[PDB]
Amino acid sequence: PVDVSVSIFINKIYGVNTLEQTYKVDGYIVAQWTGKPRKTPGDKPLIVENTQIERWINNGLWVPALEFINVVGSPDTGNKRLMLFPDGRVIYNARFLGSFSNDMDFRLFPFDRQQFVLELEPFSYNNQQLRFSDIQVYTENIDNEEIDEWWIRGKASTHISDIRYDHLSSVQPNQNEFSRITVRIDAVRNPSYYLWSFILPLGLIIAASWSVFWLESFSERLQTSFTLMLTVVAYAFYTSNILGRLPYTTYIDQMIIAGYGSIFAAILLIIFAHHRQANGVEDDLLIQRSRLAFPLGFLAIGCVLVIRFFT
Amino acid sequence: PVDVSVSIFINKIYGVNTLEQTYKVDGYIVAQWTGKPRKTPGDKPLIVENTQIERWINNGLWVPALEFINVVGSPDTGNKRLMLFPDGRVIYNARFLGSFSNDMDFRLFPFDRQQFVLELEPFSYNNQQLRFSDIQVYTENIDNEEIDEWWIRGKASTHISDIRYDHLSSVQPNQNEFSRITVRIDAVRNPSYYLWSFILPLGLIIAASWSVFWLESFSERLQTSFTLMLTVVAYAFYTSNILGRLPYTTYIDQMIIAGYGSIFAAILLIIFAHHRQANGVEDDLLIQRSRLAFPLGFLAIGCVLVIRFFT
Amino acid sequence: PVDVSVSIFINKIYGVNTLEQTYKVDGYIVAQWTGKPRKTPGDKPLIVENTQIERWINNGLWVPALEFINVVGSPDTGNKRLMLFPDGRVIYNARFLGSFSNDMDFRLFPFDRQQFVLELEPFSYNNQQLRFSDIQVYTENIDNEEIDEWWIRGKASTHISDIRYDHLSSVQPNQNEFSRITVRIDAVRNPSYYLWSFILPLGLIIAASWSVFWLESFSERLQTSFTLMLTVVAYAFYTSNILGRLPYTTYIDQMIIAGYGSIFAAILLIIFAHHRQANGVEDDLLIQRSRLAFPLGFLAIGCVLVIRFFT
Amino acid sequence: PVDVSVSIFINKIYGVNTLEQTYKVDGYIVAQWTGKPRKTPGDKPLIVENTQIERWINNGLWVPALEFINVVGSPDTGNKRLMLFPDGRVIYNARFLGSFSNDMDFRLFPFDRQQFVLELEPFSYNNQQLRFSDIQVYTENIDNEEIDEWWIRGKASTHISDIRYDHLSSVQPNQNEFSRITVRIDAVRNPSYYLWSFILPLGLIIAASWSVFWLESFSERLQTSFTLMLTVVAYAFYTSNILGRLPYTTYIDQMIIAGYGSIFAAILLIIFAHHRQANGVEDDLLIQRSRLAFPLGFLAIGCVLVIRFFT
Amino acid sequence: PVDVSVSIFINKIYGVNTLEQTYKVDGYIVAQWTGKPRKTPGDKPLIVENTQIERWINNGLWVPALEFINVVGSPDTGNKRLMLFPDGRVIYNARFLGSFSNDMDFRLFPFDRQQFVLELEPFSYNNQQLRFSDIQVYTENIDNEEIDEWWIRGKASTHISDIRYDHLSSVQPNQNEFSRITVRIDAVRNPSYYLWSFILPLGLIIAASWSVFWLESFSERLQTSFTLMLTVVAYAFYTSNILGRLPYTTYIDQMIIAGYGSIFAAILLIIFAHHRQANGVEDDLLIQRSRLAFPLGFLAIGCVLVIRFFT
Ligand SMILES: CCCCCCCC/C=C/CCCCCCCC(=O)O[C@H](COC(=O)CCCCCCCCCCCCCCC)COP(=O)(O)OC[C@@H](O)CO
Ligand SMILES: CCCCCCCC/C=C/CCCCCCCC(=O)O[C@H](COC(=O)CCCCCCCCCCCCCCC)COP(=O)(O)OC[C@@H](O)CO
Ligand SMILES: CCCCCCCC/C=C/CCCCCCCC(=O)O[C@H](COC(=O)CCCCCCCCCCCCCCC)COP(=O)(O)OC[C@@H](O)CO
Ligand SMILES: CCCCCCCC/C=C/CCCCCCCC(=O)O[C@H](COC(=O)CCCCCCCCCCCCCCC)COP(=O)(O)OC[C@@H](O)CO
Ligand SMILES: CCCCCCCC/C=C/CCCCCCCC(=O)O[C@H](COC(=O)CCCCCCCCCCCCCCC)COP(=O)(O)OC[C@@H](O)CO
């Protein structure tokens, strides 16, 4: 095979769409291999711009078609240069811009760790004809940087693996294993916006529904409760606008469901108290003092939900 | 005719849009046929990358144009390679990315079974000039995998049929029947998100409107009812944001309409009771005990709606 | 001129967008004419695929550029084949995919009849140089089929007309009249979704506001009314999300305005009754019995609004 | 220079987007000039379709690149024909489809006059090398026609001006002035949809808040007021969905702000009356009769807001 | 190296999207350098239009590929001309249309200063082979002009820097430093729309919740408060529709959170007063006079929030 050394420079990561779990990566790819020696005007390396690589390929020069595996749509290719050397080494540099997809797990939604994956692979040549010798990813432009709500933590881990393709087994009998480069850039979500923007109003709503226990009249303890209940219920599709329609519950929507149960338990408790308060004064010392025992219960539920993340 | 053996490798299925009933399928297609023997540099199969297939077709090599029938828009074609053999067999491999449409039935919306269909057909040649000998679809990448809310269950059933085209009957008198490959991938919807996200809040709303019967004062039994009624009524267009504007009712919207009827029957019953309660105490033993008979009625209605699916 | 016989096969009609009154039509177009006799390899008709029609046109073969007049954007052209005969007849088949616009009238919105129009015309040649001899549209794939909410009723009426172009009068002095093919496919909207999804909740709301007359206390007859009034008022922009911002009123929004007037007349009537009820018991036998005369008035208004459609 | 006579046929104007103040114009452009005489097959004018104009330009024929100045994105060019004459005149006809931008003023939003502007200019040649002799715009297809909510009033005024470009002053020392054609099509907005859809519900809301003065109990005069106030306040972003986030106030949003002030003044007046009604019956003859003086004040405010438009 | 003198004419800046912090810039770029002298027809500079620059590059003419660094997507290139001189200077003019991204800081959202940045750089040649001699940006078309809500203040500051690329260090050992042009156009946001559209309704809401202290009955002082609280709480995602999901708080959302705290403190204060008002008249002179001390507290909080911007 031929040894192709790749350098991926990530200019920027933007447009991290969690609805379809895609992220737009812009950058440059530099694939360098060695071939037969050639003659150039002078002895400098010859630069062939875009549109002219086709003329050199029609002349007979071997240029591999490296593709992105985890891309959504076709990648936008900007300029591409082909830099040839007198000693015989060929360099193919190209600006890629692609919507790449990765399987993202949102079970811890505000406090979230994901990774952006770039999968690069020869389209035609298996590792018996093209082997990726090494890759260094030069992600210094976004190495420690918040893009929209994602901090980029750590370095980009680079792996070179080999993927067996069963669909090419009939057309290539015993050589269908393709060299592949995987670039992982770990990202940690910034939970600050959800903290001041959704956790805080829902916290004031839940605290206000704690406060409706401290009232004396039944005309205000049930109507308010119902207004606060339906206000929490209206927040059901908050994460489905940010994330997809996920089968699991995040932390935000579990807090919303805890709000459902809290206001519903409050409503049922107060309705039961007024129903047993029919045939007289009918006042017990326990229910009137349950105004302070209910926020403690919600705090215990919140703590036992956090403690799973804490361990 | 010539025997074209197809292999479709499905890399991923994503973007399953139920608004227009489309789904984006990315993959590779490998069509293999045999022609006259040819000479190549050495005796290895010769790989012709993209942009160079046109030169070989202008030279005179026969490459069929296989198209996708059920596609929305034009399919994005990534790289395409053409691998020629000394013994004469030609292989056309191409990365397709297409928005494909299938007729989807959403009469059982959360608990839903659909299928993703790929229809592949020669654009020009009928089965007297090009016959699909066989197809194997290598869908191992998504064989048992949840993509967004769809589990992929079972294998991809592959069929080769022949479609008669009446519009080509005048231009091709007695040979207008085209070979076609249909690939069906069955998918089952994950109902979990609708269970914790819409079934649960609507269940608490309906249970709270059961609970308003247990009140004593008329100032709270009608106002609450109306707030809960309009809260359920505001959920009318929930499925039309997920599905289209379907002429039939799903299970979610039938539950919403059952909510309409339940709160409306509650409101009418309580209004009638207070209207017949004009000229005295006017209390009957039946209406005051109908607080427990109404959730049983709603549970019976829910059970008889489920039992149609159960059989 | 030359006689060009067209066959339009409509594969599917999808994406019927009533916001900008466009609809996406996918299909095949087969234009057949006769020229000078030619020689082909063997005596079979020669099939020239895409990309190779340009070589034959550069050789000197006459291929007209047929365009779509009522298209939005540029039409997506898939594969195109050019099938030449030894006896001299030329066939140009091409897969078109276009967003076509038609002037749609939504004055009867749920109960709506529209038509999808395909306008096809030579771009360069007037009817002195290219005449459309006949067209048959093979719309058997969608002949009796509901696509999203449109039933396709009847056959596709095909017309061949001639359009005079005044802008080409200076460059072509007395021959600027172009042959044109118009294909009309009549469609009838399915009103079922609006019936169970918007007509039903608004009907229960209007019936509940009929029911608030049956109350006795003023604290409930005005507040409820106002809640139901603002609930109906919030439905003003329901059709503007489905249709455009139309200058006329449909049936849905006239029902919404009838709701406005009904709840407002109820509110004004009850406020006037309580204002004249100041200086005593002040009870008249007419207003207390107007609880049953108001739904009859709304039913009469609905009937006289329907009877215009009935005639 | 050479005299280029332009004819712009506007097929349709559609997609008038007031969010970014763009409008999609579809049409044909016919630019006619005269060159050296040439020989054609026979003596008829020779029609060169798309794809073949490039061959004639490579042969050496002068075809100018006319561009659109006020376009958003790149214009979609459909077919283009090049019609050459034996006497030497060259005609370039091309179907353009472009999103064009014009500076739109929405200070009178429902009752609005705008104009759609097409700016056409040679890309390379200044007026010393290419002068636009005349233009006639053949806008008979939309001459008196409502497209979405815009009536096209009057004819399309056509102007030929000359624009000096300072950026080309260094590369072209004393000849950087380019001929330009501006086509203005005046349009008047249809206010009907806003009249029956937003003016009417807001009018009933404001009239209902006039009607809450006629009540006797304080428990209904403040709560209702607040519900109607927040209903009007929820309509703040109505125009920002139709127009942009404009720095000025239209007529709709000034009516909304007048609603704000009216309900707020009502709320403050009633709260002040009940606060001064503390130490007794405390009833004055003026405030109880201000129920009729407040709608007169709002009508005077509306009239003095209209009278600026009236003059 | 060769000295390339650039002139960027900004036709318009439009589509300033603050969700992904991009802005669409349309304009012309004129890059002028000097090469070997050449012969042209006559002695005028020869203009080579689009499509023909490729023929001259294949002939052997050196045309650099200048790219935009901060672009989102691939830039739309309209017409491009190549104007050659007999004395040897080459001019490449091209209409660019690009979505450019800049890091925007929205910590002062209505009262906001940003800058639109155009970064231009040779794709292939480092500053040892191509140096940008100077740039003048001719932004007279938008020099003092409001586009959507941005005033363009000042001139466009132009800088020529040199960027070292580590990813090109292996392929170019000691010459990987590329010349770059950065064009900054400062823009100041127009806060007027947020002033009359969001600041004003929220101000009336906060003033109305000041006014609910002036009431006497507890049935109106808590329910109203809760309605106004939830009305303010519903405005949490106002800026996330305009800006992104920013980790920091702007001025609008800090005003919203101040609204949260104000209504919540009002609700808690009134609930505490009624809870301590259990065992008698229980009236203190301080709480009843706190109706006027609470808006002063909110004004002090607003002033101390403004005074950070004031310094
Ligand atoms: C003791 C101290 C005071 C406490 C009193 C108030 C407390 C009331 C608690 C409410 C629930 C608390 C749990 C909060 C978080 C719950 C959120 C949660 O865990 O998930 C949902 C559970 O379903 C649920 O909750 C459903 C549970 C019902 C929620 C409504 C509760 C109201 C109960 C009526 C009141 C009782 C009256 C007493 C009657 C005697 C469903 O996720 P899902 O399916 O995707 O799983 C699959 C996925 O996890 C992996 O694929
Ligand atoms: C007995 C125990 C207690 C029960 C008391 C409360 C129970 C009240 C029941 C309400 C309805 C229950 C059904 C729930 C599911 C109903 C949903 C449903 O089946 O579909 C809709 C039916 O229309 C409908 O419902 C319309 C039915 C009306 C809904 C409102 C009901 C309020 C009735 C006023 C109160 C009565 C007062 C008593 C007066 C004497 C329309 O689908 P569509 O057209 O697409 O078909 C075509 C498609 O199926 C195939 O193409
Ligand atoms: C008698 C039995 C009981 C009845 C009592 C309740 C009944 C109250 C009726 C309300 C209106 C009924 C009509 C319903 C349908 C009305 C809908 C309608 O026809 O259209 C709108 C009419 O404007 C309108 O309605 C505006 C009419 C006003 C609507 C509000 C009515 C409340 C009246 C205050 C209460 C009266 C108190 C009595 C005071 C003495 C405007 O379309 P537009 O411009 O595009 O035309 C152009 C286009 O048609 C062709 O280009
Ligand atoms: C006398 C008869 C009865 C009347 C009693 C009720 C009447 C109450 C009137 C309310 C306002 C009426 C004006 C209605 C239209 C106002 C709309 C308007 O003119 O624009 C806004 C004005 O700001 C405004 O209004 C702000 C004004 C405040 C609005 C709220 C008013 C409530 C006042 C509290 C009650 C008073 C209690 C009495 C206390 C002693 C801001 O546009 P903007 O910046 O883009 O300009 C730049 C742009 O114009 C050019 O670039
Ligand atoms: C004295 C005169 C009368 C006053 C009485 C009423 C006044 C009540 C004040 C409310 C808060 C006032 C602050 C208003 C602006 C606050 C907005 C703000 O500063 O930001 C948020 C602060 O969190 C917050 O506020 C959270 C604070 C809580 C908000 C709710 C307050 C209700 C308190 C319950 C009532 C007390 C009862 C008394 C009990 C004894 C979070 O930004 P974030 O994270 O992105 O930072 C990172 C970023 O800044 C840089 O990356």
Numbering used by the authors:
A (entry chain B), B (entry chain C), C (entry chain D), D (entry chain E), E (entry chain A): 11 to 321
Q: What's the paper's own text on this?
A:
Pentameric ligand-gated ion channels (pLGICs) mediate synaptic transmission and are sensitive to their lipid environment. We demonstrate that the model pLGIC, ELIC (Erwinia ligand-gated ion channel), is positively modulated by the anionic phospholipid, phosphatidylglycerol, from the outer leaflet of the membrane. To investigate the mechanism of positive modulation by POPG, we determined structures of WT ELIC by single particle cryo-electron microscopy (cryo-EM) in the absence and presence of agonist in MSP1E3D1 nanodiscs with 2:1:1 POPC:POPE:POPG (hereafter referred to as 2:1:1) or POPC. In combination with streamlined alchemical free energy perturbation calculations and functional measurements in asymmetric liposomes, the data support a mechanism by which an anionic phospholipid stabilizes the activated, open-channel state of a pLGIC by specific, state-dependent binding to this site.
Seeking a mutant that remains open in the presence of agonist, we added the mutations P254G (previously shown to slow deactivation) and C300S (previously shown to slow desensitization in the presence of agonist), and produced P254G/C300S/V261Y/G319F/I320F (ELIC5). Strikingly, ELIC5 showed a deactivation rate ~1000× slower than WT and no evidence of desensitization in the presence of 10 mM cysteamine, indicative of profound stabilization of the activated, open-channel state. Consistent with its gain-of-function phenotype, a structure of ELIC5 in 2:1:1 nanodiscs with 10 mM cysteamine, determined at 3.4 Å resolution, yielded an apparent open pore with a pronounced outer leaflet phospholipid-shaped density. Finally, in ELIC5, 9′ rotates away from the pore into an intersubunit space and 16′ opens further, such that the narrowest diameter of the pore is at 2′ (Q233). Two rotameric states of Q233 could be modeled in the structure yielding a minimum pore diameter of 5.6 Å (rotamer 1, ELIC5 CA 1) and 7.3 Å (rotamer 2, ELIC5 CA 2). ELIC5 has the same single channel conductance as WT; this along with its high open probability strongly suggests that the ELIC5 structure represents a functionally-relevant open-channel conformation. The ELIC5 CA structure shows a strong phospholipid density at an outer leaflet site within an intersubunit groove formed by M4, M3 and M1. The β6-β7 loop progressively translates outward from WT apo to WT CA to ELIC5 CA, placing the basic residue, R117, less than 4 Å from the phospholipid headgroup in the ELIC5 CA structure. The outward translation of these structures is linked to a global outward blooming of 4–5 Å of all four transmembrane helices leading to opening of the pore. In the TMD, the outward blooming of the TM helices in the ELIC5 CA structure extends to the bottom of the transmembrane helices, and is associated with an outward translation of 4.7 Å and straightening of M4 below P305, a conserved proline that produces a kink in the M4 helix in non-conducting structures of ELIC.
